[PDB]
Amino acid sequence: TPYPVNCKTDRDCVMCGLGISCKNGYCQGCT
């Protein structure tokens, strides 16, 4: 559960797939 999937913004987790749009800290999508 506690995967620290993080980000400043969507760019910061693009790498996870497409944009992987991003909460204010948290890349709650990447999965």
3-state SS of the chain?
Answer: CCCCCEECCHHHHHHHCCCCCCCCEECCCCC
Phi then psi for 17, rounded to 5 degrees?
Answer: 175, -90
C-alpha span between 15 and 1 (Å, rounded): 20
What residues does 6 pair with on adjacent strands?
26
C-alpha span between 9 and 4 (Å, rounded): 14
Q: Say how far residue 3 (Cα) sits from the centre of its chain.
A: 11
C-alpha span between 1 and 18 (Å, rounded): 22
Experimental method: NMR
C-alpha span between 1 and 10 (Å, rounded): 21
C-alpha span between 26 and 15 (Å, rounded): 14
Phi then psi for 25, rounded to 5 degrees?
Answer: 135, -35
